[PDB]
Amino acid sequence: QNPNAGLFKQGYNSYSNADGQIIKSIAAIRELHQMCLTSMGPCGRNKIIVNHLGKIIITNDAATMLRELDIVHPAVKVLVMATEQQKIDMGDGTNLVMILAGELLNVSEKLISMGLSAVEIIQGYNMARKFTLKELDEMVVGEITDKNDKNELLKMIKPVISSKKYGSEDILSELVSEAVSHVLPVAQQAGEIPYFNVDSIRVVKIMGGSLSNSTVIKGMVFNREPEGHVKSLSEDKKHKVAVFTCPLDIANTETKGTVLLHNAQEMLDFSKGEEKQIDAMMKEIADMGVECIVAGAGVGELALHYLNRYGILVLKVPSKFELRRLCRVCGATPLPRLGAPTPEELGLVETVKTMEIGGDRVTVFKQEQGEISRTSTIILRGATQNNLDDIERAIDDGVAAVKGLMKPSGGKLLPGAGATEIELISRITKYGERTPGLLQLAIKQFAVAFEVVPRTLAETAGLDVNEVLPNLYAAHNVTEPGAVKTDHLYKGVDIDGESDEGVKDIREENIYDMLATKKFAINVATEAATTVLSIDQIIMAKK
C-alpha cells in the first residue's frame, strides 16, 4: 500500500545526498577512527585480533589490523587503501594518516550542517593544504647531515621505537642503530647509487633470556644445524665457501640418465658405483681449497660422510632468498652443477661457527673487519614470544624509518609529541585571517582538525584533557619584541610517568618525527579526506 520513492534500480539500496550519506559515511568512519585514537602514542592500547585460522594475535599497529579486517563499505575502503599508500614510500605514519583523515571528516560535518557546499569544503582544504605544505618547509628546525654515526642514528630511531613498544625504547635503540651502521657504507657527497636495503637487516628471535642479552653480529644467521660432523671451523680468517644448487650426490647426465634396474648384479654395482664416484667427487671438490659447502638442495648420506673425513662443514640452505644475501657477503656464486668449484666462483668468510642461543645451538655466518658484508642480523632474546614478536615489528618499522632518510630531503625534522601540531594550528589561523572570502570557515576548521593529535596523546596518557589543552596554547602563544617568535618552539605534549605538572621541551628527550613522514602523511590524508567528501552517492550493480 505504502509506495517507495527514490529507488528505480533492481530493488537495490542507494543513498542520495539528500538523505545525508556523507554524514552517514563519516559516522561509519568515526567507528574506525575511534579504533586508532587508542593506538597512536606510547600510552596507546593494543588490540587482540582472532584470525579465522584459529590464531590469536595482538598488535598496536592499525595497518596490520586493517589487513586482518574485511573491509567492504566504500567510505572505509578509501582510507584502507590510503593506509596502504602510507605503508608504501615510508614505514611510519600508519596511525597518523588514519587519525588525521578521520578528524578532517569530523570537522567537515559541522560545515555540512551549516549548509556549506561539499565542493566549497574540498576547495577550502585544498587551499589550506598548500598553505600547510609550504609552511612545513619553514617550520623545520634541524636537518640530519647523513653522517651515519651511531649517535645520529640514536636520534632518529629512538622516537620511532616509541608509540609501538614502550620501555624498550632505549634498549632497542642501541640494537637497531648498531645493525644499521653495519649496512650503511662509508661515503659522502654521493647520491647517485642508492643503498640500505630493508632485506639487508635480518631479525631472528629465540625464546629465553631478555633484551639485555641481545647482541648484534655482522652477517647472516641460520637456524639450521651443522649437518656435517664438523661443528665449527677454525679461527683462521677467510675460509672458502662453495654454494651448490645441485644436491650432493653422484652426478647425472644432462641427457636422459634415468637409473634402471634389471638383475641383482647391477644393484651391487650401483652401490659400489655411487660409492666410488661420490668419493671421487667430494675429494676433488675439497682439494680445491674450499672448507665449507653450502648446499641449496638435499645432501646424500655418502656425500655427507666423505666431507666429514676431509673436515668440510656442511650447512644446507633450502631458501633461495637467503642464498642471494649470502652472495652479497661471502662473495660466492651459486653453481647449477656439481664437481667444479672454480676459485673465481668461490667466496671467503672469516668465521663460521655454531653458538648456543636461548639453549638451542645454531650455526651463524659472520666476519670481523674483512670481506665486507652488506647484510647484518639482529639476534633478539626474550621470555615472552608474543611481546618478542612485536619487538621484531617495531624494528622492521625502525629500519624502514632509516630508509626514510635519503636524498628526497629526508633528513629534515620537526618537533613531535604535539609540538608541531599546536604551532601549526596558530600558523594556519594566521593564513585564515589573511585570506579573504568564504575560505576562512574552511581554513579555521582545517586547523581545528589538527587538535586531535595532541588531545589523543593526553587522553591515552591519563592526563586531564581540560588542563593540557590551554597549556599547549599558552606555551606556543607568546609576546616577543619582533616578528620572529624566538627562544622556544619546543613545547610538546608531555607524556610523564612522573608526578607533578606541565609540558616538556623536545630537546630534552629528543623525541621528534621527520619532516618526510609528516609532510607525506598530511598530503595523503587530506587527499583521502577530500575524496570521501567527493562521493555523495554509491551504486552497486551486478558485474
Binding site: F8, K9, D89, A340, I535, I538, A541
Partner: protein, 534 residues
C-alpha cells in the same frame, strides 16, 4: 480487458510514471555535471572501486530496472560513439524537457503538439547553431587556445590540481601525432599505460615508447645520450641442437667444452653483434648500441654485453616489437647472418629509470616516431581509473577541435543565448502555430537546466546568477554588438567565455540538442506501457 499474467499502464498515468522515472534519473546524474560537480563511486560487489563523472561509464556499470532510464542509457551509449563527451548533459536535457512538458501534459495538451513543438524548435536551434558557432583557424600554432580546450576537458574529471599536470601532456600528445598541412590524426598512436607506486602528480608525458621488461644486470648503463637501436628476433641465450643428440662428458672440463661448443653457434652470432658496434661509430662519442632482442638472453651473454656497455633487453611483447618499427624505425632482423648496419635504426637519449619493483626503458627522442605514450601514475587503482578516464576523454576532445574546425564558447553561452533567442524569436516570427507556442516555450525553458545545474553544484543562487546574465545580454543587445556571455562558477558573476577559456566542441553540442530532442520526444509519444511475464 485482461488475460492471465499481464500488467498494463494505459491512461495518462502511464506517461506520468515514465516522466517521473526519468525525473528520478535526472536528480541522480545532475550532481556530477560540470567541473563543480561531484565524483560518484561504483562497487561491483567484488570490491572494485571506480571513480568517474562520465555519464555513460556510470550507466553501463549500473543495472536499471526502470524501462525509461534504459532508453536513456541506450541513448547515452550512442552519444559516446559519436560525440564522446557530454553524455551527462544529454540526460539533463532530456529529463528537464520532460518535466517542462509534464506541466503542459497536466493542462491537457496532446503530446504530438508537444513533440512537434520540439522538432520545430530543434530546426530553429540548428539555424542558430550555424550562426552562433565560431570558425577556428586550422593553424597548429593555436596551442595557447588548445590550453583552454584542455582545461575545458580536464577540469571536469579532475580536482583541477591534476589539470596543470595533464594540460601539457594531453596538448603535446595530440599535436605530436597530428600530421602537418591539415591532415588527420590517429588517437591509437598515443598509448596509455598505467603504473603503481608513485603519486598521480608525478604523471609525465612520454614522447617515445616505454617498455615493461628492462635489462637485468648491475652493470647495465643508466643513460645513453645517443645510440643505434637493433631489432633482433634471434635468441641470444643457450639453445639446443636442431637434431636429437646428447652431451656425454668424461670430466667437468669436458662438459664446459660441450656447452661452449653448442653456445658457439650463438657466440658466432654474438661476435657479429658486438663487432658491428665497433664497425660503425665504435670510437665516436655520443654513440651507443642497444639490444631490444625479443627472445631470452642467458646471464653469460649479459656479462659480455655489460663489458661492452650494451643494454640488453629480453622477453619483449610481440606487439611492442611491431610498435618499435614505427617509433624507432629500425627493421626487424630475423637472422644475424643477414645483419647489416643499414637495418639498425637511430634513437635519442635512452635512459633506464630504476625502481625496485619495476624497471622502465625509454625509447624517446626519435626522429620520426609518430607514436606517443602517456604514462599514468597512481598509488591505488581508483586513482589510475579516474586519470585514465580524463585522458581518454581529453584526447578525443582535443582531437575533435582539429578535425572539426568549428568551435563554440562554453559556460552555457550556447544554452542561455538559445533559450533567450527562441523565446523572443517565436514572438516576432509567429510562423509555426498557435498551439505550438507551448512546445516552443517549453523547450526554451528546458534549455536553462544546464546553466542552473552548473551553479547548483557550485552552491550559488541560480536565480541570482541568471538575472545577471540576462541583464548583460539585454545590455549587449541594446548596445548593438556581439558579446558572448557565460556564467563564471568560481566568482559567481558573469564572464566572457572567450576570455576565460571555456570552450565546448561543435560536434558535442550539435548531436546533444538533436539527440536529447529525439529521445525525449519518443518518451512522450508512448501511449501505453505493456508488461508481460511480470
Amino acid at each position: 480487458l485482461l488475460n492471465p499474467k499481464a500488467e498494463s499502464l494505459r491512461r495518462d498515468a502511464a506517461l506520468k510514471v515514465n516522466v517521473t522515472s526519468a525525473e528520478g534519473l535526472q536528480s541522480v546524474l545532475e550532481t556530477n555535471l560540470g567541473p563543480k560537480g561531484t565524483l560518484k563511486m561504483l562497487v561491483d560487489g567484488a570490491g572494485n572501486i571506480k571513480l568517474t563523472k562520465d555519464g555513460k561509464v556510470l550507466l553501463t556499470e549500473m543495472q536499471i530496472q526502470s524501462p525509461t532510464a534504459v532508453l536513456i542509457a541506450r541513448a547515452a551509449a550512442a552519444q559516446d560513439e559519436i560525440t564522446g563527451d557530454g553524455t551527462t548533459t544529454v540526460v539533463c536535457l532530456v529529463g528537464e524537457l520532460l518535466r517542462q512538458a509534464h506541466r503542459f501534459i497536466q493542462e491537457g495538451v496532446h503530446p504530438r503538439i508537444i513533440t512537434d513543438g520540439f522538432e520545430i524548435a530543434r530546426k530553429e536551434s540548428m539555424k542558430f547553431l550555424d550562426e552562433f558557432k565560431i570558425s577556428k583557424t586550422n593553424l597548429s600554432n593555436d596551442r595557447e587556445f588548445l590550453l583552454q580546450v584542455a582545461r575545458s576537458s580536464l577540469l571536469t574529471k579532475v580536482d583541477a590540481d591534476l589539470t596543470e599536470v595533464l594540460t601539457p601532456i594531453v596538448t603535446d600528445a595530440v599535436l605530436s601525432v597530428y600530421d602537418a598541412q591539415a591532415d588527420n590524426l590517429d588517437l591509437h598512436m598515443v598509448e596509455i599505460m598505467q603504473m603503481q607506486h608513485l603519486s598521480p602528480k608525478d604523471t609525465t608525458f612520454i614522447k617515445g615508447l616505454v617498455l615493461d621488461h628492462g635489462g637485468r644486470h648491475p652493470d647495465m648503463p643508466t643513460r645513453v645520450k645517443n645510440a643505434y637501436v637493433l631489432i633482433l628476433n634471434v635468441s641470444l641465450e643457450y639453445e639446443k641442437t636442431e637434431v636429437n643428440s646428447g652431451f656425454f662428458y668424461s670430466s667437468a672440463d669436458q662438459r664446459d667444452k660441450l656447452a661452449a661448443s653448442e653456445r658457439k653457434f650463438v657466440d658466432a652470432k654474438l661476435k657479429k653483434i658486438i663487432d658491428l658496434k665497433n664497425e660503425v661509430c665504435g670510437m665516436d662519442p655520443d654513440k651507443g648500441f642497444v639490444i631490444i632482442n625479443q627472445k631470452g638472453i642467458d646471464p653469460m651473454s649479459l656479462d659480455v654485453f655489460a663489458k661492452h656497455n650494451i643494454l640488453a633487453l629480453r622477453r619483449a611483447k610481440r606487439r611492442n616489437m611491431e610498435r618499435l618499427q614505427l617509433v624507432t624505425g629500425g627493421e626487424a632482423q630475423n637472422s644475424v647472418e643477414d645483419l647489416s648496419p643499414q637495418i639498425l635504426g637511430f634513437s635519442g637519449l635512452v635512459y633506464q629509470e630504476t625502481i625496485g619493483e619495476e624497471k622502465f626503458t625509454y625509447v624517446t627522442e626519435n626522429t620520426d616516431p609518430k607514436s606517443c605514450t602517456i604514462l599514468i601514475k597512481g598509488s591505488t587503482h581508483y586513482a589510475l581509473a579516474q586519470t585514465k578516464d580524463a585522458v581518454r576523454d581529453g584526447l578525443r576532445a582535443v582531437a575533435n577541435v582539429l578535425k572539426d574546425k568549428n568551435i563554440i564558447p562554453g559556460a552555457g553561452a550556447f544554452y542561455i543565448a538559445l533559450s533567450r533567442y527562441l523565446r523572443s524569436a517565436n514572438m516576432n516570427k509567429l510562423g509555426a502555430k498557435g498551439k505550438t507556442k507551448t512546445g516552443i516555450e517549453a523547450f526554451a525553458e528546458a534549455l536553462l537546466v544546464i546553466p542552473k545545474t552548473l551553479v547548483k553544484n557550485s552552491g550559488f543562487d541560480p536565480l541570482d546568477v541568471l538575472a545577471m546574465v540576462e541583464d548583460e545580454l539585454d545590455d549587449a543587445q541594446d548596445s548593438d554588438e556581439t558579446r558572448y556571455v557565460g556564467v563564471d562558477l568560481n566568482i559567481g558573476d558573469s564572464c566572457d567565455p572567450t576570455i576565460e577559456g571555456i570552450w565546448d566542441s561543435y560536434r558535442v553540442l550539435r548531436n546533444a540538442i538533436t539527440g536529447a530532442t529525439g529521445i525525449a520526444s519518443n518518451l512522450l509519444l508512448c501511449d501505453e506501457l505493456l508488461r508481460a511475464g511480470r
